């Protein structure tokens, strides 16, 4: 291997293609989109990353940084075969200084990070629920979770980073240094630079968090009336201190989330909306706990402390959508689709998450679409669509040939009713069926032009590009 020879000469560890190491790190989380990298480097330092980049340049291949490997399109591989992969999960050091600023290496995962922040000063950060998700991909695309309505996206806490550029140079980025690249890293997704270290501000772990679940027993009509009510409430009422998402599947619709406060105050907040939503619902979960407690409430069987021994996989097709307030027609269309178009074969299953993303009191929406590369600050809603194949080891049908039409149709029920400029998707919940041109518009909407200009400046040759990433286009 020409690249492996170069890596060896630079004293950078790499995986031989016919090795157990390769079979582990070279196999994508989503087996439906598993790719074969040209090579896999395992940097242990910023200098290692720079040396690895130089090797990829010499080889003439695109280079893809892999953080936690949880992207639905396997972008840690470049979203296709043939890229030099930089497996960063051996670089996960977390260090909190005297100013409560946390320096997190680019290969750190959410669980390990949360544990370290708690151990080093009882600190916390706003991020997703899954412990295996890499901090790198998470923050570059946003970073959404049960703390977003109260504390914003993970990227809203980023204040700096040490990165390696497409020409292998090493520089520091912040609001006062290479600020244009700093802006792009906060929401621009992949392809701008390889981050060796992220620098985050943090908040003290809250004294109390009350987790909850509301279970509904709604028919078709009650789904529409309930969602319409929830929409008005999300837009104008839902408190800054409260987060909520609806777990939707073929036979249920439940509300769940965290409250930065006690159960007494939470019941008084939920009571009014449960009534306005048409009743036919009840609180099925209500527990006061702490930061560590809430984190451990949404692991879904995953190990909390994960670093470089990771070999978990699934076989699925996901999709997403962001949107403003919806018309009754849109909601009706979505509900009808659930009731009449969601039948799947045994061994296959689906679920949807309806996230209370924006809204009057959402900390996320308190930030301008111009302040960071994140371009959905004006969107009330965020959705995650998930189509799973449970018995993929025996049967993947309709995949890989088809099956996409199911969730694409589910998205369309709502998207078709939206003005073109308000149609969007969330890069962290990627839709692999998208072309590079379609993806850029949906994922970055109004900030696409600025991002393409920044991309042209820092990576004109598109060395770090993936199949749907921001293209380099000078202004
Ligand atoms: C699998 C999964 C994903 C997920 C989740 C739960 C599971 C089980 N829960 C999420 C949640 O609650 N909220 C949210 O916003 N996202 C959630 N996700 C979605 C998605 O997987 C993550 O948000 C994130 O994008 C994954 O990051 P990860 O780091 O694991 O991904 P990757 O495939 O290796 O790379 C993703 C992309 O960004 C780049 N990247 C990653 N690290 C770096 C560094 N250090 N420097 C530069 N670029 C980096 C990749 O190159 C690629 O473009
Ligand atoms: C989550 O899992 C991690 C392993 O995947 C654990 O990380 C280990 O933390 C140990 C300290 O808590 C480290 O021990 C240190 O090792 C160095 C050299 O290896 C010694 O010089 C230090 O003396 C020693 N620390 C002590 C006891 O003074 C391990 O090196 C480290 N392992 C790895 C591979 O990172 C996390 O601890 C674990 N999280 C928790 C605490 O639950
Ligand atoms: C959904 O199912 C109905 C029948 O229940 C069918 O007529 C329709 O074509 C399917 N897809 C659409 C357009 O929603
Ligand atoms: Zn190969």
Features:
EC 1.1.3.-; binds 2-acetamido-2-deoxy-beta-D-glucopyranose; Uridine Diphospho-n-acetylenolpyruvylglucosamine Reductase, domain 3; binds flavin-adenine dinucleotide; globular; 475 residues; binds zinc ion; Vanillyl-alcohol Oxidase, Chain A, domain 3; binds a molecule of 3 linked components (NAG-NAG-NAG); Glucooligosaccharide oxidase; FAD-bd_PCMH; five-stranded antiparallel β-sheet
Shape designation: globular
Number of helical runs?
Answer: 14
Report the sheet with the most strands, covering strand number, pairing sense and barrel closure.
Answer: 7 strands, antiparallel
Question: What is the CATH C-level name of the largest domain?
Answer: Alpha Beta
Bound molecules: flavin-adenine dinucleotide, a molecule of 3 linked components (NAG-NAG-NAG), 2-acetamido-2-deoxy-beta-D-glucopyranose, zinc ion
**Helical residue percent band:** 25-40%
Q: Strands of the largest sheet, in order across it?
A: 15-12-14-13-17-18-16
- Count of domains: 2
Helix/strand/pairing class, anyone? alpha+beta
CATH architecture of the largest domain: 2-Layer Sandwich
CATH topology of the largest domain: Uridine Diphospho-n-acetylenolpyruvylglucosamine Reductase, domain 3
* Beginning-to-end CA distance, first to last residue: 39 Å
Question: Count the strands?
Answer: 18
Q: Give the DSSP E fraction (strand runs of 2 or more residues).
A: 15-25%
Radius of gyration in whole Å, from Cα? Answer: 22 Å
Give structural notes:
The protein has 475 residues and is of the alpha+beta class. It has two domains: 1-207 and 440-475, Uridine Diphospho-n-acetylenolpyruvylglucosamine Reductase, domain 3 (2-Layer Sandwich); 208-439, Vanillyl-alcohol Oxidase, Chain A, domain 3 (3-Layer(aba) Sandwich), CATH 3.40.462. Helices cover 29% and strands 21% of the residues. It contains 14 helices and 18 strands. The strands form four sheets. The chain has a seven-stranded antiparallel β-sheet. A five-stranded antiparallel β-sheet has the order 5-6-10-8-9. A four-stranded mixed β-sheet has the order 1-2-4-3, covered by helices on one side. A hairpin with a 5-residue loop joins strand 8 (158-164) and strand 9 (170-174). Helix 8 (220-236) crosses helix 11 (328-340) and helix 11 (328-340) packs antiparallel against helix 12 (404-415). It is globular, with a radius of gyration of 22 Å. It starts with a helix and ends in a 17-residue tail after the last helix. Flavin-adenine dinucleotide binds at residues 29, 64-71, 75-76, 88, 106, 128-130, 133-134, 136-138, 140-145, 189-190, 194-195, 428-429, 466. A molecule of 3 linked components (NAG-NAG-NAG) binds at residues 112, 115, 305, 307. The PDB classes it as oxidoreductase. The entry lists the keywords bicovalent flavoenzyme, (alpha + beta), VAO family, oxidoreductase.
């Amino acid at each position: 291997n020409s690249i492996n020879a170069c890596l060896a000469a630079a004293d950078v560890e790499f995986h031989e293609e016919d090795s157990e190491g390769w079979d582990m790190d070279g196999t994508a989380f989503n087996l439906r989109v598993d790719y074969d990298p040209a090579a896999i480097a395992i940097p242990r330092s910023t200098e290692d990353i720079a040396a690895a980049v130089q090797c990829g340049l010499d080889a003439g291949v695109q280079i893809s940084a892999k953080g936690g490997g949880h992207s639905y399109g396997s972008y840690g591989f470049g979203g296709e075969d043939g890229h030099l992969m930089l497996e960063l999960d051996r670089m996960y050091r977390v260090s909190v200084d005297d100013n409560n600023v946390a320096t997190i290496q680019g290969g750190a995962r959410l669980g390990y990070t949360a544990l370290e922040l708690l151990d080093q000063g009882n600190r916390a950060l706003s991020h997703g629920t899954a412990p295996a998700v890499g901090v790198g991909g998470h923050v570059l695309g946003g970073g959404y979770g049960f703390a977003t309505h109260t504390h914003g996206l993970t990227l809203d806490w980023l204040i700096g980073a040490t990165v390696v550029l497409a020409d292998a140079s090493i520089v520091h980025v912040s609001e006062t240094e290479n600020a244009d690249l700093f802006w792009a890293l906060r929401g621009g997704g992949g392809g701008f630079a390889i981050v060796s270290e992220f620098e985050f501000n943090t908040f003290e772990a809250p004294e109390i968090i009350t987790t909850y679940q509301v279970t509904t027993t709604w028919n078709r009509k009650q789904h529409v009336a309930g969602l319409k009510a929830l929409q008005d409430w999300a837009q104008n009422t839902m408190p800054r201190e409260l987060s909520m998402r609806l777990e939707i599947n073929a036979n249920a619709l439940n509300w769940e989330g965290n409250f930065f406060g006690n159960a007494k105050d939470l019941k008084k907040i939920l009571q009014p909306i449960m009534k306005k939503a048409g009743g036919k619902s009840t609180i099925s979960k209500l527990v006061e706990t702490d930061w560590y407690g809430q984190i451990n409430t949404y692991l879904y069987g995953a190990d909390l402390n994960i670093t470089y021994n990771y070999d978990v996989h699934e076989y699925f097709y996901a999709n997403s959508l962001t949107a403003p307030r919806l018309s009754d027609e849109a909601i009706q269309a979505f509900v009808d689709y659930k009731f009449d178009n969601s039948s799947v074969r045994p061994g296959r299953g689906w679920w949807i998450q309806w996230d209370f993303h924006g809204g009057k009191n959402s900390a996320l929406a308190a930030v301008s679409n111009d302040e960071t590369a994140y371009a959905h600050r004006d969107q009330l809603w965020l959705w995650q669509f998930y189509d799973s194949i449970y018995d993929y080891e025996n049967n993947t049908s309709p995949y890989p040939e088809s099956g996409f039409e199911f969730m694409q149709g589910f998205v369309a029920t709502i998207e078709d009713t939206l003005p073109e400029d308000r149609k969007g998707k969330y890069f962290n919940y990627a839709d692999t069926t998208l072309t590079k041109e379609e993806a850029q518009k949906l994922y970055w909407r109004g900030n696409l032009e600025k991002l393409q200009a920044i991309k042209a400046k820092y990576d004109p040759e598109d060395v770090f590009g993936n199949v749907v990433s921001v293209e380099p286009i000078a202004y």
